Design a protein around this nucleic acid. Sequence first.
RNA 1: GUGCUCGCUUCGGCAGCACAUAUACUAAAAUUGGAACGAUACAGAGAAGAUUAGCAUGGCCCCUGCGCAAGGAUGACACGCUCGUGAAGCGUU
Lengths: 84, 68
Amino acid sequence: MDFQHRPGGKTGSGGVASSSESNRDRRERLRQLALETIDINKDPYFMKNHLGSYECKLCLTLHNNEGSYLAHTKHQTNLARRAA
Amino acid sequence: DEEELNDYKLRKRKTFEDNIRKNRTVISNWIKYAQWEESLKEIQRARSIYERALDVDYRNITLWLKYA
RNA sequence: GUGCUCGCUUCGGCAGCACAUAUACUAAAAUUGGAACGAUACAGAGAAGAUUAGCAUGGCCCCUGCGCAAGGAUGACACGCUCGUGAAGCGUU
Ligand SMILES: [Mg+2]
Ligand SMILES: [Mg+2]
Ligand SMILES: [Mg+2]
Ligand SMILES: [Mg+2]
Ligand SMILES: [Mg+2]
Ligand SMILES: [Mg+2]
Ligand SMILES: [Zn+2]
């Protein structure tokens, strides 16, 4: 057989991860991307709870997902209200 | 403390020699090795390092300037 | 050792002549220092999601191969350099 034209595979691989492992890896990567964009934007309103949840201290609003806080950018009117 | 200092100096010299052997023409590795040898008060070792660097590339101004 | 003597002369030998002229890492040893990489253990498969084909490039890194062929995880290994502070020299005051 064409050994140099078979699809590539290596011994001792372990296989492809399941849906749950890929889902939690995607969630961890989304958390890392959200933290990278928060550190790039340098927003001090972001906080992580003791139970591990996103919180807007300028809005005082909890967020279930990272994109919930990423869409929380109302926040300008709440920042103007909490400025004084 | 003397054996730990000897192991640290051996590790630093091994990394400097590996950085020299990886890229010979990069003279900043030679300058850093010679300044680290001069900082440990080894005049003839740094003189041998500078002479090796001048044998590698004698046309550089900064090698002559730093060795003088 | 062999052969022969205008020998000494017994019949054995002596003497003389001629030929033949330099082996061995000299050990049947005492020593000495280097190690296959197998067992256990450490260990953990390149390319910014995952599964991955690879060709190179450098040399105090090698192995398989008869190789100027081809393999060995792509054989392995092989990233961080726009302003002030001082000093020296030069020309003006
Ligand atoms: Mg990848
Ligand atoms: Mg090939
Ligand atoms: Mg190859
Ligand atoms: Mg292969
Ligand atoms: Mg491959
Ligand atoms: Mg290669
Ligand atoms: Zn907010």
